[PDB]
Write a protein that binds this ligand. Structure first.
Ligand SMILES: *[C@@H]1O[C@H](CO)[C@@H](O[C@@H]2O[C@H](CO)[C@@H](O)[C@H](O)[C@H]2NC(C)=O)[C@H](O)[C@H]1NC(C)=O
Ligand SMILES: *[C@@H]1O[C@H](CO)[C@@H](O[C@@H]2O[C@H](CO)[C@@H](O)[C@H](O)[C@H]2NC(C)=O)[C@H](O)[C@H]1NC(C)=O
Ligand SMILES: *[C@@H]1O[C@H](CO)[C@@H](O)[C@H](O)[C@H]1NC(C)=O
Ligand SMILES: *[C@@H]1O[C@H](CO)[C@@H](O)[C@H](O)[C@H]1NC(C)=O
Lengths: 501, 192
């Protein structure tokens, strides 16, 4: 079915925003299209320049507290020239009249390629987590030691990250099962009948006069019937799944009293306040729907494969044989004094019948499905494990250590604790509260606007997915592809008709 | 697990009938004859067989390891899993590796609100406040407040996802589908 996209509900022009200088021609998404028809990725939202009519007196002061930075942030108490990089490389270190007093004397190596990038913007409707929506390099005061890890090295923990652990947790599972089904049935029927008849009568008369007559008759018949039926079917099924993860480290982002990056701060400052779903939908795709309150660096791998077996056998044999025969004898002889008369009539007739039938039909079905995935670490050591894991049957001792070192070099998320974005907006801003509830309504409308819930349901219980407009449905193993219309299992057709030529 | 069932039935019946009639009458010069013979047999046959075999197997393997450097640790893991040949030097390497980097085994526990410094600004009230907070935390959200799974599946809680670990002989999420369906048998005559 060529289902089109009814995706143009237009709204009325709202009031112009004087400070932002933008209009809010609105729109909404209604229909995606479940089948191979017209794909429609038309984004919701529209902008327009407008002549401002209000004086735009609202403005964000420079926090009225201390030295303003070059981007809009402020020093709290000790963000002066003390080796505390907040704004830029030399932006905060622009001019230093006093001596460059170091904040810490001990040698603490910077957090290299570790959870330092703790911000993640995973989309619940989308895919893997995003980058950091905030600044994670800023630090407040005295260094907080992180004296832990594999080797003897000291890392730094930013003031935005509340906690980080180096627990090298690791677990894996295995499972397997077996199913078996078998049925057999034998049937045999035989019939036997035999019929025979006799008829003999003789008549002779003699009181010259003489008379003699004799009748003879016979009969033969038998009908043997035979029937045979057989049935057999076997089924087997095996399903199992395994998974394993190598955890590297875990962190918990501080919920409140959070510092933000200059780009996100500028985006929140240049943000409307009259429920502009158009710009809010863009901001949502740009900076994710909700950030991570706590993550889990590392990597996981899993392989699954499935087995299914089916068989059917049916046999039927029929035999029919009939024989019927008839016998008759007539003899009459008459005698004069000198006269003799004779008569002899004999009749013989037999009939035979034969019939044979056979049915021999075998059917077998097999279904196998295998899936596997892996992620994390360097590309060399990661896929070297993948090639030997898939049907290798011989695991090495050094390859796992190489994988461990590789994932220590480059980890990836495993477990992610979630937190909404509208709780991350900075407080006491220009219009923080109204923007907070506005972004809350925006994320609610995003999560309830378009999903599998609003699309159409597939057939045969096919799990429906949504991959950028294409509302395809994953069809089961025993069934065929798109739309789950054609079965793919057609009962074998049999024609015992006589060949034409 | 294995199961085998066999049933065989055989039925055979034969019935036959025989009759002979002969009558002869004689005159002084008159002769009358009569001969009537009847024969009829009947045979019956029936056969039945049932042959059904079923077998089930279930295997589950789990293993884990932790501690030490990543090189020496997983070198022990690869040779332990179905290796059947343990070395003498690999255990010493594992010992040196875990001496380099150990990990927790047994942990004696103590509440945090007992760790707050005394004679602070509002130490005592903050102490009981954090005690009430940890009590509300430990009694607020857990498996106790979530819903119970099916077939005695142990329910876990991993960051909101209140999944339940289903037994080995059973299938996955929600423990709804059995995964063990009694084999189906149809002795019906083939349509075509
Ligand atoms: C129906 O007939 C087939 C004939 O192929 C049977 O398969 C076997 O075939 C070989 C060689 O053709 C014979 O020597 C065997 O005797 C056959 N088996 C049996 C049990 O007779 C098949 O088994 C028959 N029945 C079904 C249900 O297919
Ligand atoms: C039911 O019939 C099957 C037929 O396969 C029996 O399995 C054996 O099969 C072989 C070859 O087909 C025969 O030579 C054996 O004689 C069969 N075994 C026996 C004991 O007769 C199977 O054993 C039968 N019974 C069950 C419960 O399945
Ligand atoms: C005639 O009689 C004989 C002897 O009783 C019997 O065996 C036979 O079946 C009968 N019918 C015939 C020969 O058609
Ligand atoms: C029935 O007639 C068929 C035809 O040849 C023969 O083969 C069979 O033996 C007969 N059965 C009996 C019981 O007479």
């Amino acid at each position: 079915s060529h289902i089109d996209c009814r995706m143009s509900p237009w709204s009325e022009w709202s009031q112009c925003d004087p400070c932002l200088r933008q209009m809010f021609r609105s729109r909404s998404i209604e229909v995606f299209g479940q089948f191979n028809g017209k794909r429609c990725t038309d984004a919701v939202g529209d902008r327009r320049q407008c002549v401002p009519t209000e004086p735009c007196e609202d403005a964000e002061d420079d926090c009225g507290n201390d030295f303003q930075c070059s981007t809009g942030r402020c020093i709290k108490m000790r963000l002066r020239c003390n080796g505390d990089n907040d704004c830029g490389d030399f932006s905060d270190e622009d001019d230093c009249e006093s001596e460059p007093r170091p904040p810490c004397r001990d040698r603490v190596v910077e957090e290299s390629e570790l959870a330092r990038t703790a911000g993640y913007g995973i989309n619940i409707l989308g895919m893997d987590p995003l980058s950091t929506p905030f600044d994670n390099e800023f630090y407040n005061g005295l260094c907080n030691r992180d004296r832990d890890g594999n080797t003897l090295t000291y890392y730094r923990r930013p003031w935005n990250v509340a906690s980080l652990i180096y627990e090298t947790k690791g677990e894996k599972n295995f499972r397997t099962e077996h199913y078996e089904e078998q049925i057999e049935a034998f049937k045999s029927i035989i019939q036997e009948k035999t019929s025979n008849f006799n008829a003999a009568i003789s008549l002779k008369f003699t009181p010259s006069l003489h008379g003699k007559g004799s009748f003879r008759f016979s009969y033969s018949k038998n009908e043997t019937y035979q029937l045979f039926l057989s049935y057999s079917s076997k089924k087997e099924k095996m399903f199992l799944h395994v998974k394993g993860e190598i955890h590297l480290g875990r962190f918990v982002m501080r919920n409140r009293d959070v510092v933000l990056t200059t780009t996100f701060v500028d985006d929140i400052k240049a943000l409307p306040t009259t429920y502009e779903k158009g710009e809010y939908f863009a901001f949502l795709e740009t900076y994710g729907t909700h950030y991570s309150s706590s993550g889990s660096l590392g990597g996981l791998y899993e392989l699954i494969y499935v087995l299914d077996k089916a068989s059917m056998k049916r046999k039927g044999v029929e035999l029919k044989d009939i024989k019927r025969c008839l016998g008759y004898h007539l003899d009459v002889s008459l005698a004069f004094s000198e006269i003799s008369v004779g008569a002899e009539f004999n009749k013989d007739d037999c009939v035979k019948r034969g019939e044979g039938r056979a049915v021999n039909i075998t059917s077998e079905n097999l279904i196998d499905d295998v899936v596997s995935l892996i992620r994390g670490g360097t590309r060399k050591y990661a896929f070297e494990l993948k090639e030997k894991l898939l049907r290798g049957t011989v695991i090495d001792v050094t390859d796992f250590v190489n994988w461990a070192s590789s994932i220590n070099d480059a980890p990836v998320l495993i477990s992610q604790k979630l937190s909404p974005i509208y709780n991350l907006v900075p407080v006491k801003m220009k219009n923080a509260h109204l923007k907070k509830q506005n972004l809350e309504r925006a994320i609610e409308d995003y999560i309830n606007e378009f999903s599998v819930r609003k699309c159409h349901t597939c057939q045969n219980g096919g799990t429906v997915i949504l991959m950028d407009g294409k509302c395809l449905c994953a069809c089961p193993f025993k069934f065929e592809g798109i739309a789950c219309e054609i079965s793919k299992q057609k009962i074998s057709e049999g024609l015992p008709a006589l060949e034409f030529p």
